[PDB]
Design a protein around this motif. Structure first.
Motif, PDB file in Angstrom:
ATOM      1  N   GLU A 190       0.926  -1.258  -0.369  1.00 41.17           N
ATOM      2  CA  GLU A 190       0.159   0.126   0.028  1.00 41.17           C
ATOM      3  C   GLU A 190       0.700   1.214   0.141  1.00 41.17           C
ATOM      4  OE1 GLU A 190      -2.680   0.317   3.544  1.00 41.17           O
ATOM      5  OE2 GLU A 190      -4.059  -0.705   2.911  1.00 41.17           O
ATOM      6  N   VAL A 191       0.336   2.217  -0.979  1.00 35.94           N
ATOM      7  CA  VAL A 191       1.338   3.802  -0.613  1.00 35.94           C
ATOM      8  C   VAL A 191       0.245   4.652   0.065  1.00 35.94           C
ATOM      9  CG1 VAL A 191       1.723   3.457  -3.180  1.00 35.94           C
ATOM     10  CG2 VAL A 191       1.631   5.530  -2.081  1.00 35.94           C
ATOM     11  N   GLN A 192       0.249   6.242  -0.238  1.00 35.18           N
ATOM     12  CA  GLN A 192      -0.791   6.489   0.124  1.00 35.18           C
ATOM     13  C   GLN A 192      -0.237   8.133  -0.897  1.00 35.18           C
ATOM     14  OE1 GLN A 192      -2.371   4.687   3.404  1.00 35.18           O
ATOM     15  NE2 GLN A 192      -3.277   7.456   3.016  1.00 35.18           N
ATOM     16  N   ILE A 193      -1.683   7.939  -1.196  1.00 34.19           N
ATOM     17  CA  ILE A 193      -1.418   9.471  -2.294  1.00 34.19           C
ATOM     18  C   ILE A 193      -2.421  10.452  -2.200  1.00 34.19           C
ATOM     19  CG2 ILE A 193      -0.240   8.169  -4.311  1.00 34.19           C
ATOM     20  CD1 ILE A 193      -3.824   7.886  -3.710  1.00 34.19           C
ATOM     21  N   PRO A 194      -3.069  11.226  -2.560  1.00 36.31           N
ATOM     22  CA  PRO A 194      -3.939  12.494  -2.708  1.00 36.31           C
ATOM     23  C   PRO A 194      -5.102  11.594  -3.169  1.00 36.31           C
ATOM     24  CG  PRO A 194      -1.657  13.281  -3.809  1.00 36.31           C
ATOM     25  CD  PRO A 194      -1.399  12.043  -4.117  1.00 36.31           C
ATOM     26  N   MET A 195      -6.361  11.654  -2.690  1.00 39.87           N
ATOM     27  CA  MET A 195      -7.152  11.305  -3.962  1.00 39.87           C
ATOM     28  C   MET A 195      -8.041  11.790  -3.789  1.00 39.87           C
ATOM     29  SD  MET A 195      -8.498   8.472  -5.117  1.00 39.87           S
ATOM     30  CE  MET A 195      -7.823   7.131  -4.540  1.00 39.87           C
ATOM     31  N   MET A 196      -8.318  12.672  -5.321  1.00 36.49           N
ATOM     32  CA  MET A 196      -9.476  13.820  -5.931  1.00 36.49           C
ATOM     33  C   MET A 196     -10.221  13.097  -6.025  1.00 36.49           C
ATOM     34  SD  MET A 196      -6.734  15.269  -9.193  1.00 36.49           S
ATOM     35  CE  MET A 196      -7.663  13.692 -10.088  1.00 36.49           C
ATOM     36  N   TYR A 197     -11.160  13.655  -6.402  1.00 32.61           N
ATOM     37  CA  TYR A 197     -12.738  13.731  -5.184  1.00 32.61           C
ATOM     38  C   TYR A 197     -13.842  13.909  -5.742  1.00 32.61           C
ATOM     39  CZ  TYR A 197     -17.403  12.742  -3.830  1.00 32.61           C
ATOM     40  OH  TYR A 197     -18.924  13.168  -3.222  1.00 32.61           O
ATOM     41  N   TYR A 270     -13.786   8.756  -7.570  1.00 31.44           N
ATOM     42  CA  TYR A 270     -12.392   9.023  -6.570  1.00 31.44           C
ATOM     43  C   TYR A 270     -11.412   8.566  -7.335  1.00 31.44           C
ATOM     44  CZ  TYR A 270     -15.580   8.572  -2.608  1.00 31.44           C
ATOM     45  OH  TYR A 270     -17.052   8.535  -1.850  1.00 31.44           O
ATOM     46  N   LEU A 271     -10.132   9.648  -7.973  1.00 30.53           N
ATOM     47  CA  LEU A 271      -9.177   9.420  -8.815  1.00 30.53           C
ATOM     48  C   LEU A 271      -7.528  10.215  -8.017  1.00 30.53           C
ATOM     49  CD1 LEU A 271      -8.383   8.336 -11.457  1.00 30.53           C
ATOM     50  CD2 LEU A 271      -8.451  11.019 -12.114  1.00 30.53           C
ATOM     51  N   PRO A 272      -7.193   9.160  -8.493  1.00 30.03           N
ATOM     52  CA  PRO A 272      -5.277   9.878  -7.946  1.00 30.03           C
ATOM     53  C   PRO A 272      -4.721  11.454  -8.656  1.00 30.03           C
ATOM     54  CG  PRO A 272      -5.293   7.100  -7.938  1.00 30.03           C
ATOM     55  CD  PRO A 272      -6.562   7.700  -8.722  1.00 30.03           C
ATOM     56  N   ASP A 347      -8.119   2.347  -5.921  1.00 27.85           N
ATOM     57  CA  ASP A 347      -7.310   2.746  -5.342  1.00 27.85           C
ATOM     58  C   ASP A 347      -6.236   1.668  -5.388  1.00 27.85           C
ATOM     59  OD1 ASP A 347      -8.862   1.300  -2.890  1.00 27.85           O
ATOM     60  OD2 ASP A 347      -9.349   1.186  -4.768  1.00 27.85           O
ATOM     61  N   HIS A 348      -6.143   1.689  -6.939  1.00 24.33           N
ATOM     62  CA  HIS A 348      -5.309   0.024  -7.136  1.00 24.33           C
ATOM     63  C   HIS A 348      -5.182   0.121  -8.599  1.00 24.33           C
ATOM     64  CE1 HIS A 348      -9.161  -2.301  -8.091  1.00 24.33           C
ATOM     65  NE2 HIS A 348      -9.963  -1.122  -8.458  1.00 24.33           N
TER      66      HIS A 348
END
Length: 374
Positions: A190-197, A270-272, A347-348
């Protein structure tokens, strides 16, 4: 050949996937076809035949395969308020080697391509110069294309092909709605990323992964760019399923189906926020596809030079794609339907393409396995 564009990228994608295990993929079919046209026009005889043959252009006798250049030029001149596609196409040739003026003229007039004499024996200077020429042609977005090491081997000719793309969304994401989410890679890390919404109007369909099992579906989401012509199409397997299960399904006909079956509607997305890039050794890729004579001293390149020593030492392609919130304001009792809005949470890993909706042509194809910076 209208459909030849689609098959090129699909074939290229499977090659890259083959040798690319687990990495992000990103390439432009038009850009690569542009590069291959340059090689085709430079070559003659068997050299030219392998290229046309490998491209499946055996039966094309009147230059029909060059027709894509028109649409390609249109993109290079599109309005910036819609998107920016920077392209750097150049043949770099050892100082003193003659280049046929007709080839040079064609390159300039139809291929948006330059022919640059350089001294390849100065490894650092020539890598530096090539990099600066490439940066200068891409608003400095495409960097470090080459290294001095790339010219350790005698080189007399190098083909350089680069492309940057970023588009303005028809419907912007608002940056205050972008939050850290975890992204689950297909190897379970897993990595943490900015998730646009956002909630907005997209094209959306659901499709069978083919197993006909319960639930067995993947989602296709098409997000339009400003101007209504270009879009990003994302293909996202169900959360417990790997992208690799969907990839083999990738074919020109499927893409057609997606394009036709998706429906415009409100979707929650939800898109990175992410960038993706890939540098590919076209020489490597093409050798596996039959094209080899152009890369050895048996090369017949009399289309570009009467110099008999000359062959293509190096063929490099690099793409860089940037995705973020930026785009246009959304146009303002359908709220009662909110419970029915589909939800796409990227998210994958996912496959994507950038395409012109009106012409159907593929600007880019790739996948994201790792959305994280550096």
């Amino acid at each position: 050949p209208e459909e030849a564009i689609a098959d090129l990228s699909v074939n290229m994608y499977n090659r890259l996937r083959a040798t690319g295990e687990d990495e992000n993929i990103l390439f432009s079919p038009l850009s690569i076809a542009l590069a291959m046209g340059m090689m085709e026009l430079g070559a003659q005889g068997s050299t030219q035949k392998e290229i046309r043959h490998s491209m499946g252009y055996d039966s094309l006798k009147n230059g029909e395969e060059f027709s894509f250049l028109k649409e390609f030029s249109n993109m290079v001149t599109a309005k910036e308020s819609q998107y920016v596609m920077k392209i750097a196409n150049s043949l770099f040739v050892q100082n003193g080697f003659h280049v046929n003026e007709e080839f040079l003229q064609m390159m300039k007039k139809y291929f948006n391509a330059a022919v640059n004499h350089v001294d390849f024996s100065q490894n650092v200077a020539v890598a530096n110069y090539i990099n600066k020429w490439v940066e200068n042609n891409t608003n400095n977005l495409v960097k470090d294309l080459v290294s001095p090491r790339d010219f350790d081997a005698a080189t007399y000719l190098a083909l350089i092909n680069a492309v940057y793309f970023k588009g303005n969304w028809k419907s912007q994401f608002r940056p205050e709605n972008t939050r850290t989410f975890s992204f689950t890679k297909d190897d379970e890390s897993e990595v943490q990323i900015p998730m646009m919404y956002q909630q907005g109007e997209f094209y959306y369909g659901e499709f069978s992964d083919g197993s006909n099992e319960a639930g067995g579906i993947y989602q296709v989401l098409e997000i339009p760019y400003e101007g209504d012509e270009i879009s990003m199409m994302l293909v996202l397997s169900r959360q417990e399923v790997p992208l690799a299960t969907l990839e083999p399904l990738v074919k020109a006909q499927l893409v057609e189906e997606w394009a036709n079956s998706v429906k415009k509607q409100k979707v929650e997305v939800y898109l990175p926020r992410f960038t993706v890039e890939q540098e590919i050794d076209l020489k490597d890729v093409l050798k596996a596809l039959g094209i080899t004579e152009i890369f050895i001293k048996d090369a017949n390149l009399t289309g570009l030079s009467d110099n008999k020593e000359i062959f293509l030492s190096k063929a490099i392609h690099k793409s860089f794609l940037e995705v973020n919130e930026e785009g246009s304001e959304a146009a303002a009792a359908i709220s009662r339907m909110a419970v029915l809005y589909p939800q796409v949470i990227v998210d994958h890993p996912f496959f994507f393409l950038i395409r012109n909706r009106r012409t159907g042509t593929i600007l880019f194809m790739g996948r994201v396995m790792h959305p994280e910076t550096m």
